Amino acid sequence: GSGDLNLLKSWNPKLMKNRKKVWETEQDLITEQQKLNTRLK
């Protein structure tokens, strides 16, 4: 036991399971807002 306990808990955003979740949701919303921008043109 040496390093940060934060890595071993879920809520912290810095570790790679949650950062990936944010990546995915943001990517989906980028697709949606992109298509909806193209529709209005």
Partner 1 sequence: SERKAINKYYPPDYNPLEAEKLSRKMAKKLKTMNKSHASIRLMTPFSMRCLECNEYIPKSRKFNGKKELLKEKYLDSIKIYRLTISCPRCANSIAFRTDPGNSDYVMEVGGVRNY
Q: How far is the CB of 25 from RNA (least distance, A)?
A: 12
Report what 30 binds from partner 1, RNA, none; CB cut-off 5-8 Å by kind.
none
Q: What is the C-alpha to C-alpha distance for residues 28 and 33, in angstroms, rounded to an integer?
A: 9
Q: What is the C-alpha to C-alpha distance for residues 3 and 20, in angstroms, rounded to an integer?
A: 22
Which H or E element spans position 35? helix 18-40
| Contact set with partner 1 (CB under 8 A) | 4-6, 9, 11-14, 18-19, 21-22, 25-26, 29
List the x/- string, 4-33, binding to RNA by CB under 7 A.
Answer: -x--xxxx----------------------
